[PDB]
Amino acid sequence: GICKSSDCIKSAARLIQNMDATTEPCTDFFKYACGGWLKRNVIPETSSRYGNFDILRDELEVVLKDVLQEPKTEDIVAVQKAKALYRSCINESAIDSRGGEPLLKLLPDIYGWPVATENWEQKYGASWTAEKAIAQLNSKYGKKVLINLFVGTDDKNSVNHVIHIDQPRLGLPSRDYYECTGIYKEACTAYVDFMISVARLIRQEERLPIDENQLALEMNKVMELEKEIANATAKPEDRNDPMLLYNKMTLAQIQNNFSLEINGKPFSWLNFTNEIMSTVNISITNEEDVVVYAPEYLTKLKPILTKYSARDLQNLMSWRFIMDLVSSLSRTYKESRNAFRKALYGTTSETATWRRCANYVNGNMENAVGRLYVEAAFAGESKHVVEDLIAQIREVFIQTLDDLTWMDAETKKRAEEKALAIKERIGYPDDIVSNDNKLNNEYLELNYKEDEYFENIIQNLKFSQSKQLKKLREKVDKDEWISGAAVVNAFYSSGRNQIVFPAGILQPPFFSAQQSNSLNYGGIGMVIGHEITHGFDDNGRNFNKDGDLVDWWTQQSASNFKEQSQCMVYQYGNFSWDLAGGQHLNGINTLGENIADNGGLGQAYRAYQNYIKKNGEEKLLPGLDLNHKQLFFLNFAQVWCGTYRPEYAVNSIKTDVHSPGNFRIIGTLQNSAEFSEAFHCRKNSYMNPEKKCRVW
Ligand SMILES: CC(C)C[C@H](NP(=O)(O)O[C@@H]1O[C@@H](C)[C@H](O)[C@@H](O)[C@H]1O)C(=O)N[C@@H](Cc1c[nH]c2ccccc12)C(=O)O
Ligand SMILES: *[C@@H]1O[C@H](CO)[C@@H](O)[C@H](O)[C@H]1NC(C)=O
Ligand SMILES: *[C@@H]1O[C@H](CO)[C@@H](O)[C@H](O)[C@H]1NC(C)=O
Ligand SMILES: *[C@@H]1O[C@H](CO)[C@@H](O)[C@H](O)[C@H]1NC(C)=O
Ligand SMILES: [Zn+2]
């Protein structure tokens, strides 16, 4: 009664080669599940992290390279553009011959970069204004510095867009890096050195004198500036309640409550907003509704900015944009980023050009690239099987509502309502393959020159920003997908209340219409449950069936949610990560993801049990002395096999809201009675603690 098919032997060999049977499953399931893989692999010099997900990404890029590198006579314009963009990106000779020339041409359009400019105050300082300079970078290039103003979906009215004001991203991975000592010292040093290196290259190219001390003096001041801005930003832990972050105010209330004086101005929120919106010829009055996500940051900002000159501010502002462009310039410019990237990612080399390029055009033309990808690698008949798995897991979610003792009937009803309303998106939107007109029109305004990569990326920046700003008065498009098809990942959108499973993730180990169901439910089944459960985590639970930020929880049920969640906050907060130097994970920042993991795996298991009851046991896999309940958990764990570079581990423990793969495995299985039952784990064995967390 052993399956001897090609498909069964492929998956069995993979499972067998990845696992380490010499490790007791109940002592450490990550080692048991991934030990074979760990011993065989070493993180590539160009990778920050390596494992199942990254391997799948590398493989998807091979497909992209295959479909983009060769022109085909019957290619529609949309496809011709993606290939021309790809070609401009991989032509390093053409790029290298241009030096930093394309950047130099750009500088005057962003008020320059003081350090690499002679007499900046006379040239730009004369007509300079915080409102114009910040707006220029924001509206033409998408670079949000000092004050992040953007057009997005109204948290409280899903169908509309509204202007949002929030704190900006930083040059370093997170606000923590700015302590600049111990584990962060090399990063801060490399960052300032990086600033200095680029300023030096620009000066040498522009034929300007180079005073090393002056370069150091100016760049250290931008670091001093950003340190203050970093310290002023609110921690992620204080931004995890959607209800509290949402503060709708009029531009008048903003001008009144959040005064700012820069370079002796004062700051005009109306002028700043219009300097931005004018790009799309949209006028704003002081009566305009704005959602402020960082009122405290704006408040703390006032005293900070008065201590700095227009020159200091612009040195940081242009730097933040320039650091993102340097890798699109000649080799000399590319090399200046070496120490910085090693400090942040641990990588000693850049990823292959063709891979960075495939990724770049996939990210900028997701529908065009998605179309080629699915035609080359996705079997349309998979969509149906997946549709069915989703129907099954959604059902299991609803059924489980009855067993949950911590919620009252009224709240369970609304939870059921929300669950039923979840809209699924599987594989790719049929339109990208069947509607050539629409696909072409999406890229109509884009015209790529094969020998001008830099001009091409700048055009994409302007186009994407214009497209975004133009949405202010428009309604949110219902049929719009939140992800391209050639992506190895899955998502959940609170505002649209939808789950998306791109074609890129509908492949082994996650799914295959031909692999054993235990594997399917353990992989993609768990993924579907993860996404659905996001609609009910510490963030998602705050949004209703239509994606509106509104409370549908009774005070008691809301209170019980936090109590049940707290168990996971402490559980994960207690895991110490060796790669990150023994630091503990952030149980609060990873809460949502941990809830999704734990809820999702149980939901998938429940669904698998339903499948077995209704269909009977499956033929076992050859070479594995494990039954299907055990294979279910083995596959789930192998989805997460992987490892991290120390430098990137220090980065991800701060920036990744997901727990590292090994802890996603250990944490989830520790809370699973089904797992311990499947592997006969003794009580209190490492993988089977008496105390188990559970929310969904
Ligand atoms: C269950 C898994 C298949 C999908 C699941 N996606 P999900 O958490 O819904 O969503 C992800 O994280 C969110 C915080 C962001 O808002 C999303 O845009 C998305 O990046 C996840 O753990 N994604 C992780 C793991 C992962 C997916 N693709 C990867 C590629 C490389 C490395 C890791 C990954 C991530 O995005 O990191
Ligand atoms: C790269 O660009 C240069 C300059 O335009 C050109 O001579 C060369 O043909 C291009 N190489 C390829 C492979 O297209
Ligand atoms: C913004 O204010 C400046 C004065 O600093 C003015 O020159 C400019 O025209 C104003 N822009 C808009 C869009 O009102
Ligand atoms: C670790 O778990 C204990 C037990 O509940 C908890 O009291 C403590 O706060 C946790 N520590 C962290 C860092 O989460
Ligand atoms: Zn998630």
Q: 58 CB less than 6 Å from ligand 2?
A: no
Tokens 């600033």, residue located: 195
- Rounded to whole angstroms, the Cα distance separating 385 from 520 reads 10
Sign of CA pseudo-dihedral 490, 491, 496, 497: positive
Q: Determine if ligand 2 sits within 6 Å of the CB of residue 69.
A: no
The alpha carbon of 18 and the centre of ligand 5 are apart by a number of angstroms equal to: 24
**How far, in Å, is the centroid of ligand 5 from the Cα of 599?**
11
Detail the residues annotated as belonging to a binding site for a peptide.
Answer: 49
How far apart CA 596 and CA 530 sit, in angstroms, is: 4
Task: Name the closest-CA residue to atom 10, ligand 3.
Answer: 271
List residues near ligand 4 (CB under 6 A). 570, 573-574, 584, 587
Going by the DSSP 8-state scheme, the letter that residue 680 receives in this structure is T
Distance CA 624, CA 620 (A): 8
Ligand 1 surroundings by CB, under 6 angstroms: 53-54, 57, 488-492, 505, 527, 530-531, 534, 593, 657-658
β-partners of residue 584 are 576
**Cα distance between residue 246 and residue 373, in whole Å:** 39
| Count of residues making up the chain | 696
Structure tokens belonging to residue 587:
């149980």
**What's the gap in Å between 54 CA and the centre of ligand 1?**
12
- The CA distances from residue 63 to 274, 309, 381, in Å, are 44, 50, 20
- Say if residues 37 and 656 touch (Cβ distance below 8 Å): no
Burial of 649 (0-12, 13-18, 19+ CB in 10 A): buried
For the chain, the helix, strand and coil percentages under 3-state DSSP, each to the nearest 5? 60, 5, 35
- For residue 453, the ligand closest to its alpha carbon is 2
Rounded Cα distance, 411 and 413, in Å: 5
List, as one string, the DSSP characters of 320-359. HHHHHHGGGS-HHHHHTTHHHHHHHH--SSPPPHHHHHHH
How many whole angstroms separate alpha carbon 492 and alpha carbon 536?
Answer: 11
User: Which structure tokens are listed for 278?
Assistant: 């004018």
Q: How far apart are CA 300 and CA 174, in angstroms?
A: 18
Question: Maximum Cα–Cα distance for the chain, whole Å?
Answer: 84
State the Cα–Cα distance between residues 99 and 331, nearest whole angstrom: 8
Q: Which residues of 165-196 are buried (b: 16+ CB within 10 A; e: fewer)?
A: bbbbebbbbbbbbbebeeebebbbebbbbbbb
Q: How many Cα atoms occupy the beta-carbon half-sphere of 535 within 13 Å? A: 32
Instruction: Please name which ligand lies nearest the alpha carbon of 452.
Output: 2
Report how far residue 313's alpha carbon sits from residue 319's, in angstroms, rounded to the nearest whole number.
10
Q: Could you identify the residue written with the tokens 């993180």?
A: 43
How was this entry determined? X-ray
**Which ranges in 365-381 belong to alpha helices (H)?**
366-377
CA distances from 132 to 3, 116, 258 (A): 68, 20, 18
Tokens for 57? Answer: 């990404």
CB atoms under 10 Å from CB of 447, counted, come to: 11
Resolution in A: 2.1
Signed CA dihedral, 503, 508, 513, 517: sign only: negative
| Burial class of residue 430 (count of CB atoms within 10 Å of its CB; 0-12, 13-18, 19+) | exposed
Residues facing 292 on adjacent strands = 165
Distances (CA, A) of 144 to 100, 196, 200, 321: 23, 22, 25, 9
User: Roughly what angle, to the nearest 10 degrees, separates helices 591-615 and 526-534?
Assistant: 130
Q: How far apart are CA 198 and CA 184, in angstroms?
A: 21
Q: Are 109 and 128 in contact (CB under 8 A)?
A: no
Question: What would the two tokens of residue 688 be?
Answer: 């089977």
Cα dihedral 386, 387, 392, 398 in deg (nearest 10): 130
Query: How far is the centre of ligand 3, averaged over its atoms, from the C-alpha of 271 (Å)?
Result: 6
**Pocket mutation for ligand 4, best pick of 570, 584, 670 (most atoms within 8 Å of C-beta):** 570
First to last CA, the chain: 36
Residue ranges of the binding site for Zn(2+): 530, 534, 593
Instruction: Look at ligand 4, atom 5, and give the residue with the nearest C-alpha.
Output: 570
The CATH superfamily holding the domain 51-377+430-476 is Neutral endopeptidase , domain2 (1.10.1380.10)
Per DSSP, the chain holds a count of helices (H) and strands (E) of: 32, 11
Return the active site residues.
531, 597
Q: Whose CA is nearest to atom 8 of ligand 2?
A: 94
Token pair listed for 209: 């004198």
The SS3 assignment for 92 reads helix
Which atom in ligand 2 lies closest to the alpha carbon of residue 91? 1
Neighbour tally for 280: CB within 10 Å:
17
The torsion defined by the Cα of 402, 406, 408 and 409, in degrees rounded to 10, comes to -10
Alpha helices in 486-525 (DSSP H): 517-520
Q: Where are the alpha helices (DSSP H) in 548-672?
A: 555-573, 591-615, 628-639, 646-655, 661-670
Closest ligand to C-alpha of residue 595 is: 5
How far apart (Å, rounded) are the C-alpha atoms in residues 71 and 75? 8
The crossing angle, in degrees rounded to 10, of helices 130-141 and 269-277 is 30
Kind and range of the H or E element at 644? strand 642-644
Interacting residues of 677 by C-beta distance below 8 A, sequence separation 6+: none
Q: How far is ligand 1, taken at its centre, from the CA of residue 688, in Å?
A: 27
Asked if 543 and 535 count as a contact pair (C-beta separation under 8 A), the reply is yes
Tell me, rounded to whole angstroms, the distance of Cα 442 from its chain centroid.
24
After which residues does the chain become discontinuous at a C–N distance over 2.5 Å? none
Identify the CA nearest to 503 among candidates 494, 495, 512: 512
Amino acid identity of 110? I
Burial class (CB in 10 A: 0-12, 13-18, 19+), 103: buried
The helix (H) or strand (E) run that includes residue 178 is none
One-letter amino acid at 207 equals R
* Annotation: binding site: 49, 530, 534, 593
- Dist. CA 339–CA 186, nearest whole Å: 9
Q: Is 452 in the pocket of ligand 2 (CB under 6 A)?
A: no
Q: Would you state the structure tokens that stand for residue 287, as one six-digit string?
A: 């009566």
Identify the CA nearest to 87 among candidates 381, 342, 537, 448.
448
Amino acid (1-letter code) at residue 218: E
Sequence-separated (6 or more) residues with CB below 8 Å from residue 255: 268, 269, 270, 286
In sequence order, the β-bridge partners of residue 165 are 149, 292
C-alpha count within 13 angstroms, C-beta hemisphere, residue 433:
15
579 neighbors 644 (Cβ within 8 angstroms): yes
Q: Which residues contact 190 (CB under 8 A, 6 or more apart)?
A: 339, 340, 342, 343
DSSP code for 49? E
Sign of torsion, CA 325 331 335 336?
negative
456: its two tokens: 């091409």
Decide whether any atom of ligand 3 lies within 6 Å of the 274 Cβ.
Answer: yes
Whole-angstrom distance, CA of residue 509 vs CA of residue 428: 19
Residue 51: enclosing H or E segment and its boundaries? strand 49-51
Provide the 10 A C-beta neighbour count for residue 326.
Answer: 21
Q: What is the domain partition of the chain in residue ranges?
A: 1-50+378-429+477-696, 51-377+430-476
Q: Residues 222, 312: contact at Cβ < 8 Å?
A: yes
Which of the listed residues 89, 93, 101, 450 should we mutate to test ligand 2's pocket, taking the one with most ligand atoms within 8 A of CB?
Answer: 93
Q: Ligand 2: which of 86, 90, 91, 353 to mutate, judged by most atoms within 8 Å of the beta carbon?
A: 91
How far is ligand 1, taken at its centre, from the CA of residue 653, in Å?
15
Q: Which CATH superfamily is domain 1-50+378-429+477-696 in?
A: Collagenase (Catalytic Domain) (3.40.390.10)
Strand locations in 217-276 (E): 248-250
CA 394, 493, 365: angle at the middle one, nearest 5? Answer: 120
